[PDB]
Structure 1
Amino acid sequence: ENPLKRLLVPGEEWEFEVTAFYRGRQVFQQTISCPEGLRLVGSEVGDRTLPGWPVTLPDPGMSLTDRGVMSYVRHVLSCLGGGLALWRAGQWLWAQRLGHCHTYWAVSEELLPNSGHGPDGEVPKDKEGGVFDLGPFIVDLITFTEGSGRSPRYALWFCVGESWPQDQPWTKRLVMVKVVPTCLRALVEMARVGGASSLENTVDLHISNSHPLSLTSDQYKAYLQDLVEGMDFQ
């Protein structure tokens, strides 16, 4: 049996590492494991009955140093309302806006949101929107194990309350939020150190009900191909 299929079984929960940045400064980090996904809110007030795990972004500061911009940050957090919903349905991650803050997203690197390609689009409000497809990710991951392509991107960056910072430093934006499906961080890491020969390495898939995985490089590449053949493609 393929242990990597555990990611795509219904009822299983991925871990989402949420990291928030106010003006190029990390202010918040929390890991969420919820079946109905997460929900980036700013605590006003609110509808407690809304599905998804509430992730409250912290209030900024009331400092004489940095207040001409922290009032703007607090202004954005006051308009998140229902917040930014992010959940998983099968092999897709879905994001939707429930508040009044226009939000732009992109699947980029972990230490840098804006590479140059621009945003992958804006988080929709009236409909749910696909932000990540596991299909193309595994395919690119196999090619990465096959010493050819580059490392596939898995980090979801969100630019809240402002337009996407293209050709501008991302430290200028008021509210930036990085969300990482920690299973994908592991899969990439497993392919980063594991590709030494046919030895064993250990990968924690970081998902609900799962044990560590001691696999060989060939075994890992075999499971990945078997994972692909059992997924929808476009």
Structure 2
Amino acid sequence: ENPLKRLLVPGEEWEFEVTAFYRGRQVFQQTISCPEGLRLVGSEVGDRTLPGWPVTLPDPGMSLTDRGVMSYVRHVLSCLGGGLALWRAGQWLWAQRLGHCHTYWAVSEELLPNSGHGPDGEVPKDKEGGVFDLGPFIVDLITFTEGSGRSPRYALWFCVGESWPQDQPWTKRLVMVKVVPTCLRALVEMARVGGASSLENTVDLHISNSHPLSLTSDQYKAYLQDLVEGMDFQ
């Protein structure tokens, strides 16, 4: 069968890598696998009946050093309330704002949140909003393996409590959070090493109850095509 289809099995858990930046400085990183997805919080803890594994963004610390902008960070964190939920259902990633901080998002490069022609949207409150569709990603990944397109983007970036930094250095923003579904990072890496030859390379999908796959470039491309045939497109 097609081992890549495990990505879309109802009940399957993806691993998400969450990395937080205060003023362009990495302050936190955690990898989460949970049937409920994840929920970014500032530790106003907090309603435990809220959905999602709570991912606590750290207090900036009480140093005199940098006290000004860090007090702004602390204020934003203190207003996160219920926070920012992110979870998977089907071929989609969904987000929802459960607290008071307006949050904007984009699917971007690993290292650069904003370029990017502005944000892809604002995370909604009181209902879920789709932030990522695996379907077009796989189509673009197939194109990538054929030499005909760019590396497909999979890094979700959230700007918390401020406008999206369009045409501004992203490092000026108080609270920026990157979430990478690590299966997608692995799929892109696997595509890059595929053209090395027709020997076998290993790809670790980083999903629940899954084993590292050893595949030839042909096998991999074949599985991607089969995977995309069973996915939903409008």
Fold conserved (TM > 0.5)?
yes
**Paired-residue identity, %:** 100
Contact 1:38–1:87 (8 Å) recurs in 2: yes
Cα gap change, 1:221 to 1:136, in 2 (>3 Å): same
**3-state secondary structure, aligned to 2:54:** strand
Shift of 1:81: 0.8
Q: Deviations over 1:63-109 (max 9, x none)?
A: 22211111110111111111100000010000000000000000000
**3-state secondary structure, aligned to 1:69:** helix
Partner Cα distance (1:221, 1:165) in 2: 37
Shift of 1:126: 2.2
Shift of 1:150: 0.3
Contact 2:108–2:116 (8 Å) recurs in 1: no
- Structure 2 gap ranges (5+): none
Shift of 1:116: 3.7
- Structure 1 gap ranges (5+): none
Q: Deviations over 1:192-228 (max 9, x none)?
A: 1112232110000000001110101111001000000
Partner Cα distance (1:32, 1:197) in 2: 34
Question: Aligned Cα RMSD in Å?
Answer: 0.7
Q: Deviations over 1:160-194 (max 9, x none)?
A: 01000010001000000000000000000000111
Give the ranges of 4+ consecutive aligned residues of structure 1 lying more than 3 Å apart after TM superposition.
none
**Which residue number in structure 1 is paired with residue 227 of structure 2?**
227
Partner Cα distance (2:70, 2:197) in 1: 51
Shift of 1:62: 1.5
Contact 1:116–1:167 (8 Å) recurs in 2: no
Partner Cα distance (2:140, 2:213) in 1: 21
**3-state secondary structure, aligned to 1:71:** helix
